[PDB]
C-alpha cells in the first residue's frame with residue numbers, strides 16, 4: 001500500500017481537462033446532495049474545527065478540519081489563513097492541503113492540494129445558498145473583498161443566477177483594480193463601486209475580506225434592496241465579523257454549521273435563539289426557505305470539513321478516471337508489524 | 345517551493361546510516377532538553393490532541409496532534425490506533441504520518457512517516473522519565489505487552505539504565521515468543537514471565553498493551569518492589585487503563601501532558617488534584633525526582649505533539665546531510681496570489 005498523491009500539476013490537469021464551469025457545477029451538485037443528506041439525518045455535520053492563532057506578521061490562524069465517513073475514510077483538511085501572504089510573499093492568503101485516511105486501518109491513502117479545492121467548494125456553497133435565498137432573476141452581484149475567494153464567489157454565482165454585472169470594492173486599490181482581469185472569463189462585467197453603492201444596488205452580495213478582528217463592518221448599515229441575499233464568507237479568527245449588527249438583526253440568517261458560526265461566523269453577533277434553520281435543513285426541506293427570497297437573507301458561511309471531503313471526492317473521481325497522480329510509500333509498513341525497526 | 349517528502353525507504357536509510365543506538369540517543373537528548381525548556385517556561389505544552397473513535401473491526405481511534413513553534417513551523421501528526429491491524433492486515437497497530445508547515449505562511453514544507461518516529465520518541469520519553477524516577481542501578485525491566493512499543497521501550501531504557509534482564513508478558517503467545525528476536529539487537533536477555541512475577545521482580549516496568557476499554561489492569565496489584573518505577577505507556581480510547589487503582593493511589597504520579605492524561609492516561613482513575621509536577625518540570629529540576637527514585641513512581645505517558653516535532657527534527661537533520669527524500673509540488677501556489685485559477 002502506498003499513498004496516492006495528486007500534485008498541483010495533477011489538480012491543474014483535472015480543471016484543464018474538465019473545465020472550470022463543469023468542475024464547479026459538479027461540486028455545486030455534490031454539495032447540494034450532501035447537504036440534503038445531512039438535513040435528512042442520513043449524515044452529520046463535521047465536528048468543530050480547531051486552530052492555532054498566529055500573530056505575525058499580521059494576525060492569522062492555522063486550522064485542522066476532520067470529517068469521518070464511518071467504515072470508509074477520514075478526511076482531514078489542514079489550512080492556513082495568513083492575510084499578509086499576497087503582499088509579503090506572493091503566496092495565497094489561504095494555503096492548505098487535504099488528506100484521506102482509511103477508516104479501517106488508519107493508513108494515509110490520498111493527499112492533494114487544498115488551495116484550489118477550498119476556493120471551489122466555498123464558491124459552490126454560496127451558490128447552493130443563493131439558489132435557495134436569492135431572487136432567481138438576480139442580475140447585480142456585489143463583492144466586498146476582491147481577493148482569491150471573490151473569484152470563485154463570482155464564478156459560482158454566475159452559474160446559478162443570471163448575473164449581468166458585479167459591483168466590487170476592496171480596501172486595497174490594486175486588488176480591486178485587478179479584479180476585472182481575474183473575472184473576465186465569466187463574462188460578467190465588473191465595475192468598481194463603493195460599499196454604500198453596492199449595498200443600495202446589489203441583488204446579491206458576497207463579503208470575503210481579510211478584515212481584522214473588530215474592524216467590521218465592511219458593508220455599511222444603510223439602505224439595501226428588500227430582496228437582498230448576502231453570503232457572509234469572511235471567517236478566520238474569533239471576533240472577526242463583516243456585517244453590521246442592525247442589518248443582521250433584520251435578516252433571515254442561515255448558517256452552514258450553527259455551532260461553528262456562533263463561534264466564528266456572523267452569528268457571533270447574534271443570540272443563538274435568533275438563528276434560522278441551517279443550510280442543510282434548507283436543502284432537505286425547502287419549506288424553511290419558502291418566501292425568504294423576497295426579504296433580506298444572510299448565509300453565514302464558515303466552511304466545514306464535509307464540504308472538503310465532497311470536493312476531494314469530485315477531484316479523485318476525475319483523477320482516478322484519468323490515472324493521474326503518483327504513488328509514494330510514505331508510511332513505514334514493517335514486514336513484521338510488531339517490529340518498528342524491520343525497515344523492510 | 346515544493347514539499348520535502350521522506351519515504352519509507354529514506355527513513356530506513358536514516359536508521360541504517362545513523363545506527364539505532366545513536367538515533368535513539370539523539371531523540372532522548374532532544375526530548376530531555378525540549379521538556380526542560382517547557383519546565384522553565386521557555387516553551388509550552390502542545391494543545392489537547394483530538395480524536396475520532398472507530399468501532400470496527402475492533403474499537404480504535406484516529407487522532408490529530410498539532411504543535412506550534414512560533415515563527416518557525418507547525419507540526420501535525422495524524423495517527424491511527426487500530427489494534428486488529430497486525431493479525432487482520434499485517435499492518436502495525438499504530439499507523440501515522442507527520443507533517444510540517446511553515447508558521448509564517450502556512451505552507452506545507454515536509455512530510456514523513458510517523459510509524460518509526462512514534463516508536464522512537466515513545467521509548468525515548470520513557471527513558472527520560474525512568475532516568476529521573478527509577479533507581480540508577482535498576483537491572484530488571486518488566487514489559488507487559490510485547491508488540492511494537494515494547495521494542496523501543498526496551499531499547500531506550502537499555503540506553504539509560506544498566507539493564508541485565510527483561511521479564512516480558514503478552515496475552516498472545518506468538519507475540520511474546522517473537523519478542524526476544526525483535527529485541528536481540530539490544531543485548532538484554534529476555535525472559536517470558538507472567539504478570540505477578542514481573543510485578544514481584546522488576547525494578548522498572550513499561551505497560552504498553554492494546555487492552556480493551558475497561559479490561560484492565562494488565563499488571564496485578566500485588567507485591568511490588570518498594571522502588572518500582574512504572575512507565576504507563578498504553579493509551580488510546582477514553583476508558584482504557586492498565587494499572588490497578590490501588591497501586592496508582594500509592595504512587596508518585598507524573599504525567600507527560602496533564603489534561604491528556606486526565607482524559608486518556610492512568611490519571612483517568614485519579615482525582616485531578618492528586619498528580620505531581622508534570623514530566624517537563626522534573627526535567628527542569630531533577631531534585632523533585634531524585635527523592636522519588638526509592639519509592640513507587642508512575643510515569644503516565646500519553647504522547648504529545650511536541651515529542652513528534654522534536655523527533656522529526658532529528659530525522660530531517662540526518663536526511664538533509666545525506667540528501668535523502670523527494671520534492672513534490674503538492675500545494676497550488678498560483679502565479680497571481682489573488683487568482684485561485686492561475687494554475688502553474
Ligand SMILES: NC(=O)c1ccc[n+]([C@@H]2O[C@H](COP(=O)([O-])OP(=O)(O)OC[C@H]3O[C@@H](n4cnc5c(N)ncnc54)[C@H](O)[C@@H]3O)[C@@H](O)[C@H]2O)c1
Pocket residue numbers: 081083086093094118119122144145146147148149150169170171172175208209210211212217218232233234235236301302303304681682
Ligand atoms: N467560509 C468559508 O468556507 C471560507 C473558505 C475560505 C476562506 N474563507 C475566508 O474568506 C476570507 C477571504 O479569503 P481570501 O482567500 O479571499 O483572502 P485574500 O487575501 O485573497 O482576499 C481578501 C481581500 O479582502 C480585502 N480586505 C481586507 N479588509 C477589507 C475591508 N474592510 N473591506 C474590503 N476589503 C477588505 C483585502 O485587501 C484582500 O484583497 C478570509 O477570511 C478567509 O479565511 C472562508
Ligand SMILES: NC(=O)c1ccc[n+]([C@@H]2O[C@H](COP(=O)([O-])OP(=O)(O)OC[C@H]3O[C@@H](n4cnc5c(N)ncnc54)[C@H](O)[C@@H]3O)[C@@H](O)[C@H]2O)c1
Pocket residue numbers: 337338425427430437438462466488489490491492493494513514515516519552553554555556561562576577578579580645646647648
Ligand atoms: N504513550 C504514547 O506516547 C504512545 C505512543 C504509541 C502508542 N501508544 C499506545 O501503546 C499501546 C501499545 O501500542 P503498540 O504499537 O505496541 O501496539 P501492538 O498491537 O504492536 O502491541 C500491543 C500488544 O499488547 C498485547 N496485549 C493486549 N492486551 C493485553 C493484556 N491484557 N496484557 C498483556 N498484553 C496485552 C497485544 O497482544 C499486543 O501484542 C497502544 O495502546 C497505543 O495506542 C502510546
Ligand SMILES: NCC[C@H](N)C(=O)O
Pocket residue numbers: 063079080081094118235236302303304
Ligand atoms: N479560515 C480559513 C479556512 C476556511 N474557513 C475554511 O473553511 O476552509
Ligand SMILES: NCC[C@H](N)C(=O)O
Pocket residue numbers: 407423424425462579580581646647648
Ligand atoms: N493514541 C495512540 C497515539 C499515541 N498515544 C501517540 O501519542 O502517538
Ligand code: NA
Pocket residue numbers: 232233234235264265266300301302
Ligand atoms: Na461568516
Ligand code: NA
Pocket residue numbers: 576577578579608609610644645646
Ligand atoms: Na498512559
